[PDB]
Design a protein around this nucleic acid. Sequence first.
RNA 1: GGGGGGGGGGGGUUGUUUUUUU
Length: 852
Amino acid sequence: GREIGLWYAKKQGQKNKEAERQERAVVHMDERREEQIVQLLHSVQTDATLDQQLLEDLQKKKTDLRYIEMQRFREKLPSYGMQKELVNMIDNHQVTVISGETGCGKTTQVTQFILDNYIERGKGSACRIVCTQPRRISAISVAERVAAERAESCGNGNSTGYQIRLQSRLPRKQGSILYCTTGIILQWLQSDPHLSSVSHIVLDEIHERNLQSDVLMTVVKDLLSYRPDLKVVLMSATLNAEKFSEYFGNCPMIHIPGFTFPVVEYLLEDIIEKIRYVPEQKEHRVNRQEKEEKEAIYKERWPGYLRELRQRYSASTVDVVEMMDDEKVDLNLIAALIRYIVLEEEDGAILVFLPGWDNISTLHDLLMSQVMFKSDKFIIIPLHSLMPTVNQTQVFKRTPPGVRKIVIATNIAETSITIDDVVYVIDGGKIKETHFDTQNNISTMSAEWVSKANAKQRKGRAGRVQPGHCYHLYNSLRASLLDDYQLPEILRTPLEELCLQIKILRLGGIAHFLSRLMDPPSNEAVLLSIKHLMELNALDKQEELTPLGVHLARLPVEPHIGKMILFGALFCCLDPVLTIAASLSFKDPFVIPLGKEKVADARRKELAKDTKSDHLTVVNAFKGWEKAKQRGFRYEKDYCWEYFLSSNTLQMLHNMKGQFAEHLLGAGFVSSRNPQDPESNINSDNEKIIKAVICAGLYPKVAKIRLNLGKKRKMVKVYTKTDGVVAIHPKSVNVEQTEFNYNWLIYHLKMRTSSIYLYDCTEVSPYCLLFFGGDISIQKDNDQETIAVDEWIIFQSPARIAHLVKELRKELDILLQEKIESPHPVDWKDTKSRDCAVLSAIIDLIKTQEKA
RNA sequence: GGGGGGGGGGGGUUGUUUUUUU
């Protein structure tokens, strides 16, 4: 049996081991370079008026026609009725929590209330309000809205403005309101730990528990003792908002009623009864913690619910409800519901919430496989971040009464995009969210049930301009068993960047600060992050910042990308390394449409050329886009269209590169703020040096390619040390690649969706891993001499060459430590650049190919 | 693990949530 399997598995294993031992790469250098290396080693080794002005300005503006119209509009908001109570509550208490529903307008009214109250009281110069938003577009839009409501332009020294990354319309210093993302305040804390200039701090959308919001809340709570005059206003979504008050010592709470049109809720049984749905899928027919305790409850009440359901509904409805499955979204039911709505429901747009791209594509194909949806009376817009959302401006445009608009979207339409026309919302109760597994140090993505807050937000997405309907694709039991809120990001993401930020802000011990957070992370995650930072030489054995750790913490990227940036500056390949770092920190510039998917992969592979790297193809795309932009705006548009590239993402990457170069110039690694200065880009034309720098940055993420060849279409397998067998994601340019120069891949993103996937892999060379990898050991295996990196990356090499490489690495680490502790551009004149020069020479003109 | 057998169908090439940095 299982033992019979062994009698052939043991034979199979030996073959794989022998094949791995056969093709093992040979590290060999010519006689001239060996003599040069030994010679080099031997040589080296031996005011009062401002208040009056503001008050008079307000009094004069009170007579403006535009201001009068804006006031008439503002009076309709529910917050206008509670203006006085809000002002008194904020004035009399240090910390207040404001709970409001959708449409209450608290975001654009509370700050105006405080500012106006201070201005009319004759102390307008003491008002400096900062309101933090979770999104850049949200902050920009709110700032423009507040500026419009005040009959003024945003920024330009006026009373309101915004500041986000690489963009700021700053208002006047005193008597102003600033709308910024949450990271801006954390950056301010680096130079101003007390926020002395800030008089009022307003934290928005605290119910969305992201990293920055929680960190800022903890920092403000700690800082309140040192700033008795600071006033904090927390604004939430009136569901589990008492917990925020509890965190701040039972601070006073105030509720602002919402203003929305009524929305009718339909559940799965109601939908099936109403549309008389009959499923044809019958013919065509590893856990966590509380999940498994909610499912126990679902299965104990299922028999009793089906019964209670049999009384309220017909037999067919109960049969369909019972036979429906979980872990999937019934797209046929969604299509039937859409057909029902477009046949005998009133006019209005339909918004469909789906968990992923594949479901959106399947629903789109299902919809236009029918005759009625292929006419000009229907417009179907898929919404997803990877689609050309910048091109998707047709979602906002209204439609004539004879044509209906159907929007199939992910949760991007929950917050980022507002259609303001939707009448019917079809909520598939599945949402894809990312969890971190600290046991295996692997990120996991799966489609989980939507939370109660998510369902409420989706329902409120309808009924903004007229009464609407919401269809939830889950029964009553599932609805009653939903989670109140999604797990906060403190419990789903790695904490290395957070640990570095904690250290750079002098907030105390990492564990001590993290334990004071709302729903603090587990001790295992903290220990893993601290150990990871220690192994990167970013923290000493006493949990303090190393000289490299300071530079990593001051860079707006996670530590591995920061190390890659520093090494690219050191080795004079600044431009491609900065482009790769910007792409890895924020998105790849590639967008795909709904239908033309394989064409996008073909164009990406055409861009990749023979680099066999998912990061050098981004460099090629950026270079081509820059050339097209130089040659013309129209040609830039054609290039972006033909190669399926996002112009906005490319511009943002360019700005991020400029910011990185500015920081590098400030620190002292480079002599200019231009990433394309020739003095810092002498090795930028050599792909081997760029790959070596990539390996130096994100080293420990290595993978081994085993070319078993044989007759299984000469297919390749990918292995990882900590994990087991992994696969290359189809989005990569190496998924179908079978002619690899070297059997080693370096990657950045690795996630487990259904199988462990590598989303961006770059082919790497033996010397890149030798000089920029783990510990080097020299030993003998059977009948050949080997040199190993981390005792699992083995290369063939004679003992003399291996000892030379080990000594060279021992010297290079010291050289890099001195170059990092005291940054300075490297002068390439035979003083101490000899080690770097010979390493560059070895990487450039030694490695040729494998032996397979 | 393979195409050592059809001793089983114990394992078998199975696509991309959203966001943020003086």
